[PDB]
Amino acid sequence: MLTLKIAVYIVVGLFISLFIFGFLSSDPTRNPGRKDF
Amino acid sequence: RAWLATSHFVLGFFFLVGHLWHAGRARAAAAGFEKGIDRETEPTLFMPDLD
Amino acid sequence: TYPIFTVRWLAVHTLAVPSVFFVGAIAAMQFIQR
Amino acid sequence: MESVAYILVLTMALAVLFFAIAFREPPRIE
Amino acid sequence: MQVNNLGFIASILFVLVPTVFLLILFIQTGK
Amino acid sequence: MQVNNLGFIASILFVLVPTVFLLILFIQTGK
Amino acid sequence: ASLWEQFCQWVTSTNNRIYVGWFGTLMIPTLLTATTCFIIAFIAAPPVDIDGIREPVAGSLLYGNNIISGAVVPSSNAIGLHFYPIWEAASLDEWLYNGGPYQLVVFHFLIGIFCYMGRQWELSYRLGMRPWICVAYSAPVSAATAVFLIYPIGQGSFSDGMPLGISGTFNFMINFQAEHNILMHPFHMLGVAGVFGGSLFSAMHGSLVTSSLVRETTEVESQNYGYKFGQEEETYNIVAAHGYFGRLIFQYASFNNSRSLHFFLGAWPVIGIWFTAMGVSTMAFNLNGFNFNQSILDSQGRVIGTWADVLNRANIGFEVMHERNAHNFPLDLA
Amino acid sequence: VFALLFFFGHIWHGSRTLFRDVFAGVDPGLEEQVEFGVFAKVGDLSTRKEA
Amino acid sequence: MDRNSNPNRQPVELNRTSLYLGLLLVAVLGILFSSYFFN
Amino acid sequence: MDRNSNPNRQPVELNRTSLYLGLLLVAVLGILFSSYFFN
Amino acid sequence: DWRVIVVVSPLLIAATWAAINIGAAAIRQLQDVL
Amino acid sequence: WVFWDLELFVDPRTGESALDLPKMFGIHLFLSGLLCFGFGAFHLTGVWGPGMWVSDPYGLTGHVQPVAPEWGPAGFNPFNPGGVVAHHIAAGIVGIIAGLFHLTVRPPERLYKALRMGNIETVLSSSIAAVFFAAFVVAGTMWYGNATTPIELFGPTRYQWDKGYFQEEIQ
Amino acid sequence: RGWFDVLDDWLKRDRFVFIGWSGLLLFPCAFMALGGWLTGTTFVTSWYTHGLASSYLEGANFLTVAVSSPADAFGHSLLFLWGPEAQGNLTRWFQIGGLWPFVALHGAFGLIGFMLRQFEISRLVGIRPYNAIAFSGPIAVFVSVFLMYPLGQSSWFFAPSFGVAGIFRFILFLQGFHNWTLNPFHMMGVAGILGGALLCAIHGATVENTLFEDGEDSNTFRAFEPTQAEETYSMVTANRFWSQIFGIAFSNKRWLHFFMLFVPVTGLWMSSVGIVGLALNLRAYDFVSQELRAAEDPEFETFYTKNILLNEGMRAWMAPQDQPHENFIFPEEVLPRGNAL
Amino acid sequence: MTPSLANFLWSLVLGAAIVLIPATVGLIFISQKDKITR
Amino acid sequence: GTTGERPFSDIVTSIRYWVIHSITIPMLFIAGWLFVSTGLAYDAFGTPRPDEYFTQTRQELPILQERYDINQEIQEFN
Amino acid sequence: AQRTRLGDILRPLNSEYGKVVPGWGTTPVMGVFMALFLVFLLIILQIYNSSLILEGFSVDWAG
């Protein structure tokens, strides 16, 4: 169960970090309109 | 406790809705399409078909 | 120079007159003690 | 064996969903 | 479970008959 | 008669499946 | 040009058949996990001790349930609101016996649907659309959150959450009526207004557009072929629709502005579902529907029954039989 | 049940009979006829009030 | 008496979208009514 | 990568005589094997 | 019953007041329509 | 199906297929009247025919028997089989007379245009109406009990249980 | 100029409230229905038919007032004012529930009048009569629920009463006695009504959020002209959005608007079919397989069996007060109940 | 001639006299006095 | 846009309308009030007054049981 | 259009297509018969519904 817990924690942490670093990476500029901001 | 909990849950939910309303509007207005799609430069007209 | 009495006038009164009558009656009931 | 019937009809529904998405009539601008 | 012994033929036909109707119609479209 | 309780579904499908195959093919011929 | 930048461009790409987006990078794993566990549980999960009195309830097809009766059973009352992942069970069979699949499926589902809402905003942003489709989608999200999260939290147990099944849903509703008189709650009444009116207006708008289509086809073909995807021109005459509807009722009860009409169509059911979601969410804290039991007394003081009293008799009948072995004390405090 | 469903058939086929000329859709006009007050009689082009 | 060709014959059509809608309808109707057929 | 039209597609045909022969075959096969399916 | 008279009386007052204040215009609309 | 193009179906003056729906209705109403009268006057009466199922009020002696028509107001008691016989004789006669009128007198212009008498879909619309009327009537008479729905053939009604009909008679 | 044509002229005039030939049957009938309901809910009791107070005069509120159904003793008698029960006595007619058949029959003829008005106005204006066809759903529901269900039952007594809490009672009664939630016909109706609401919300929201920039103001509502030839929102953008969000999307607006009519209307028709079944007690009450198993296997429990138990409790605890004419004397000891509670 | 038959026949008479007849007389009169001018 | 009738905004903003309705609406309101407060409505509709639901001879519901003769049952129920 | 012997015998029964009487014709008499039929339906309905009780018989399985 410890192996499974560590696996789940790793997967969830990777997905959450991917979310955060994605919406941090100039996300307002990724649109078809004005992108100066 | 019932009055306070029920009241503040409702207010919290409607303020989440307000956050979404103003956050989406702030994003669209910063980007310049909060008033609708421009007919000449509609983005989907310059995007490839999905299939 | 619009007409006073029309079909619309009657459509308005057929509903408004009994409605105010009933509202007054229901107002009276608010004071009935058992 | 009624379990087989239930799973089969559910599977038909899900497979129809897959085909309707993956292989739909492509909307075209005419 | 003591199910209706006619439930399986009924469910199979209830689905398969309109299914084949639809498939026949779709496959012959454009003739 | 204590028949095989699967005989009826089997006979129905044994005939109906190739039947619908044939009907589908015939009706779409000429497209 | 960096690899992270390339990945960002792919994630936020509007040319993917299914949009992913950052919200999608969370939506897809969570919803996929929830779907896999739900299908496996609904087919094969062993019985679940929902009421924590060691009386397992069969929810899965292989244990004797049909599609109508099958469900993923909420986790045991003994768990209450405790977090119960797989790695907190001494065996998968203990996890199953105590209703762990319910917790896994609901938590992943809830995360997935909130991410679905965010994803709707995200794609609207990438398409240069206006941003509020997600606001309309927040109504069903609020209702689902009410039945799967808020109601359990207020009642103190995930065992009180809506079961993931058809007959399980009816059980939830019946128990909810018995303990909260939801029929006599004004927010449920607004929800019923929202859904009855949403269907009414859907029928009205659909019928008025269909009635007022511009002639484009011959009588041998479907009228739908009179519309071409992407055409500039309107496919029905709103002026004719307004003339008909403003003569059906009166001129001022009819919309002549499609924008105002489509706003009303969106707002009415959305607002009604927000109210009903908040109603379920507030009866989670036991602020129940109207109580008019023995409200009317004659002069001597004898009770004159009303329809609310008969409804109360029905509710008492439901209440005295529910969870028939779970109560040891006279009052159902949760 | 059949009687109930045959009520729909009646309304459907009676509508098809009475509305046969508009089955494929409405006329390319109808921009003046369906307006309010323009005619004394709803639909009658010979009752234009001209006022 | 001769067998003349009838001019009132029309082709029938069912597009792919209608196929998918009809198949989903049949599937969900089966999902719904199977439990009641088995009873 | 694009989805190009395959040029190897051929129409399939089953004439009416083949339909009748196949239907009679299926019918008589059912007539033959039904007694053994029921047993 | 006295109660019927008392209930009908404000109705009579309403009608007679409206008739006093509208009647000449009502008569004119009547003549204008024969 | 094969010999679809008969000259009977074309309008002699023009070239296109045409049915005189009013005259069609006159012939068919006259035939319906003849059949209704015959069924009532020969079959149900037993003059030439077996009659109809009649039973005691408690469904113990059910048998087919000639039924004389009841021409009084008692003929409108739904539990009186003589009412059924009388109806078929009288409605058959009235249908005969109505078919004669419909065979002889053309429809008014007002009605020909208003009901779209040149369109066969008008006949479908009105026939569906008459048919669902009849379906409601037969469902009701089956549910509530009728001389034409005896309990020895279709079983007792729920109202006989509700009212303890047989329990009262047994006591 | 014949008198019929002159009448048809006056009746079809363009006025604030269109009348038409249909109005001769819609307006008096609807007014009788509405006035009867308001009258009964304000002044009339159900004391002699139900043993209940049912008007504002007795102290009930908007939620608890009703035009209650007549007493069981009258069976399906039409309870005409001049009928053999009331015999022209207005007070007795009120006290025996005569207002229930008055409201129901005037409402049925008023609904017929409203559908005829739909047809008539559609023909005058020159449009297709799909609004009239859509309204057949509501009429199917009214006929099946308020007429055919009580007609199949013992009397008008078991018809739903015209009131908020009366309707709630009828709903709970159908749950506890008919297991109406288990009925597939109701399930199709639920799917139709919920899908209709969903379609309404999603079309409205999609249209409002794919609007073309047709004006300078933030108030996008002013950017639409009723006579403009151009679509006010992008169907291509909407289609792409939903194709990438949901996997599929409407691409034909005509099919979209037909679907918005088809779904709720079809749901009302299907639920009506199920109610017609319930008129004869033809209920999807039980799954016999699960009843046989639970009878033989006392360890076996599903949500279905639990709902069965809930229904038995409702029936036993509600019957004596809900059906006061049957003189149901159920002593406390026979009332089903779980432990403690 | 039972009382129920008497009341039925009176219902026919009074329905005609209190509703249909006054209604059609009023409708005919008003349609004639307020004619549409073409 | 206008079917011939005077616009409601023009009607309700006018002196003569309110000169009439300052009396008509109140008179209707008081007519209904008096209908209730004089006890007329109880007699008209047969609704029991608060001290007439139960009598000395009857402590239970007056549920109707006759098919036809209801004047008699309601009289005996009092 | 193919001619047959039966068609020729039945030709004159399908030979008056679209013939009408100018104006209102027999519409008033038609309305009178329709009103009488409505009254008749009301009578039989009310007898069946026990709102119209006649002498001599009872609406009952007995007669």
Ligand code: CLA
């Ligand atoms: C179009 C309008 C309309 C329609 C369709 C109905 C329909 C109905 N009403 Mg309602 N009614 C209406 C308007 C209408 N009403 C109005 C405006 C009022 C207020 C005055 C009422 C007041 C009312 C009451 C108080 C009651 C009804 C009732 C009924 C039902 C029974 C009717 C019946 O059997 O009468 C049959 C009568 C006719 C069909 C009319 C006569 C038809 C024939 C052809 C006429 C014969 C000619 C005549 C004999 C010549 C004599 C004329 C005279 C000069 C002598 C039925 C559903 C009853 C009900 O609801 O039961 C619960 C009931 O008690 N009605």
Ligand SMILES: CC(C)=CCC/C(C)=C/CC/C(C)=C/CC/C(C)=C/CC/C(C)=C/CC/C(C)=C/CC/C(C)=C/CC/C(C)=C/CC/C(C)=C/CC1=CC(=O)C(C)=C(C)C1=O
């Ligand atoms: C093991 C497993 C798998 C477990 C599951 C077991 C289980 C619980 C099984 C049950 C499953 C199931 C399907 C049960 C339900 C059965 C049931 C009740 C069936 C009802 C069938 C029926 C005949 C009902 C009658 C009424 C009816 C026709 C209902 C249909 C409802 C319906 C489909 C409505 C629409 C719903 C919907 C999602 C619509 C989206 C449409 C859409 C793409 C809109 C977007 C859009 C909008 C715009 O505005 C524009 C402009 C554009 C462009 C555009 O695109």
Ligand SMILES: CCCCCCCCCCCCCCCC(=O)OC[C@H](CO[C@@H]1O[C@H](CS(=O)(=O)O)[C@@H](O)[C@H](O)[C@H]1O)OC(=O)CCCCCCCCCCCCCCC
């Ligand atoms: C429970 C299961 C039952 C199913 C019932 C419901 C049906 C759902 C099925 C829908 C999926 C079908 C999408 C079709 C993909 C397609 O056409 O192109 C697939 C393309 C690229 O493939 C291709 O890949 C090619 C690779 S290569 O370059 O040619 O080598 C390349 O040409 C290019 O990238 C592209 O064309 O992929 C994309 O568009 C980007 C990502 C799409 C995937 C999103 C996730 C899918 C579902 C997860 C969401 C949660 C679900 C929860 C439970 C359902």
Ligand SMILES: CCCCCCCCCCCCCCCC(=O)OC[C@H](CO[C@@H]1O[C@H](CS(=O)(=O)O)[C@@H](O)[C@H](O)[C@H]1O)OC(=O)CCCCCCCCCCCCCCC
């Ligand atoms: C609660 C709402 C109230 C509902 C009623 C409201 C009013 C509607 C009226 C009813 C509609 C009449 C039907 C159509 C008109 C018609 O028949 O043609 C009208 C004809 C032709 O007009 C004549 O036509 C003549 C020429 S010819 O006929 O075309 O040849 C011409 O010379 C002459 O000038 C001209 O007048 O005129 C007449 O013959 C006048 C009598 C009309 C007879 C009415 C038919 C039914 C009556 C019996 C029903 C019993 C009553 C109880 C009802 C339940």
Ligand SMILES: CCCCCCCCCCCCCCCC(=O)OC[C@H](COP(=O)(O)OC[C@@H](O)CO)OC(=O)CCCCCCCCCCCCCCC
């Ligand atoms: C002989 C005994 C039995 C006979 C067997 C034959 C049975 C006939 C069955 C016919 C199938 C009808 C379906 C075709 C459907 C179809 O053809 O697609 C929709 C179709 C499209 O119409 P068009 O006018 O565009 O026609 C284009 C042509 O291609 C169609 O032929 O319109 C309809 O048919 C509308 C009515 C049905 C609409 C149904 C939509 C509902 C789908 C929702 C899915 C369910 C999900 C619910 C979730 C809760």
Ligand SMILES: CCCCCCCCCCCCCCCC(=O)OC[C@H](COP(=O)(O)OC[C@@H](O)CO)OC(=O)CCCCCCCCCCCCCCC
């Ligand atoms: C997925 C699980 C199951 C799949 C289901 C699909 C099953 C496939 C079944 C295919 C059907 C094959 C039959 C087609 C038959 C057919 O198409 O007609 C004959 C056909 C004609 O061939 P041609 O070369 O002329 O092709 C013309 C085309 O129209 C054919 O596609 O030739 C053959 O197929 C020869 C082999 C079968 C010949 C069978 C003739 C015997 C008939 C005798 C009748 C019985 C009487 C016996 C009395 C004792």
Ligand SMILES: CCCCCCCCCCCCCCCC(=O)OC[C@H](COP(=O)(O)OC[C@@H](O)CO)OC(=O)CCCCCCCCCCCCCCC
């Ligand atoms: C989260 C990421 C995405 C994952 C989504 C996975 C599935 C969602 C999409 C479902 C595809 C439905 C295809 C229907 C058939 C299809 O291809 O429809 C596509 C069709 C296309 O419309 P068009 O305007 O292109 O068609 C116009 C005419 O040609 C019609 O003949 O759209 C509709 O008709 C929408 C209304 C039906 C919407 C039905 C929704 C029902 C949902 C599924 C029910 C649940 C069953 C499961 C039981 C176990």
Ligand SMILES: CC1=C(/C=C/C(C)=C/C=C/C(C)=C/C=C/C=C(C)/C=C/C=C(C)/C=C/C2=C(C)CCCC2(C)C)C(C)(C)CCC1
């Ligand atoms: C039955 C009957 C009859 C008839 C009668 C009638 C027709 C009546 C009427 C009546 C009426 C017709 C009445 C009315 C009333 C109404 C009311 C009662 C009102 C109310 C209101 C309210 C209360 C509201 C409120 C509100 C809201 C909620 C919203 C907004 C605000 C306000 C405040 C406005 C006859 C004689 C034939 C015979 C015998 C029987």
Ligand SMILES: CCCCCCCCCCCCO[C@@H]1O[C@H](CO)[C@@H](O[C@H]2O[C@H](CO)[C@@H](O)[C@H](O)[C@H]2O)[C@H](O)[C@H]1O
């Ligand atoms: C990549 C993004 C970030 C990912 C990094 C996360 C990696 C995972 C680290 C934590 C996961 C394991 O964390 C460890 O789990 C075990 C469960 O067996 C816990 O163990 C706990 O419960 C177990 C048994 O249930 C007891 O024996 C123990 O006394 C108790 O501490 C530890 O308290 C915790 O420290």
Ligand SMILES: CCCCCCCCCCCCO[C@@H]1O[C@H](CO)[C@@H](O[C@H]2O[C@H](CO)[C@@H](O)[C@H](O)[C@H]2O)[C@H](O)[C@H]1O
């Ligand atoms: C379009 C359809 C609408 C129709 C409905 C409209 C309202 C109809 C009301 C009909 C009322 C009939 O009500 C009935 O009237 C008759 C005569 O007044 C009364 O009759 C009573 O007095 C008359 C006086 O001559 C006697 O001849 C009669 O024998 C006696 O019973 C009944 O006691 C009463 O019940």
Ligand code: OEX
């Ligand atoms: O878990 Mn499910 O239902 Ca909520 O109230 Mn207390 O708990 Mn049990 O009893 Mn009633």
Ligand SMILES: [Cl-]
């Ligand atoms: Cl329970």
Ligand SMILES: [Cl-]
């Ligand atoms: Cl406890």
Ligand SMILES: [Fe+2]
């Ligand atoms: Fe729209």
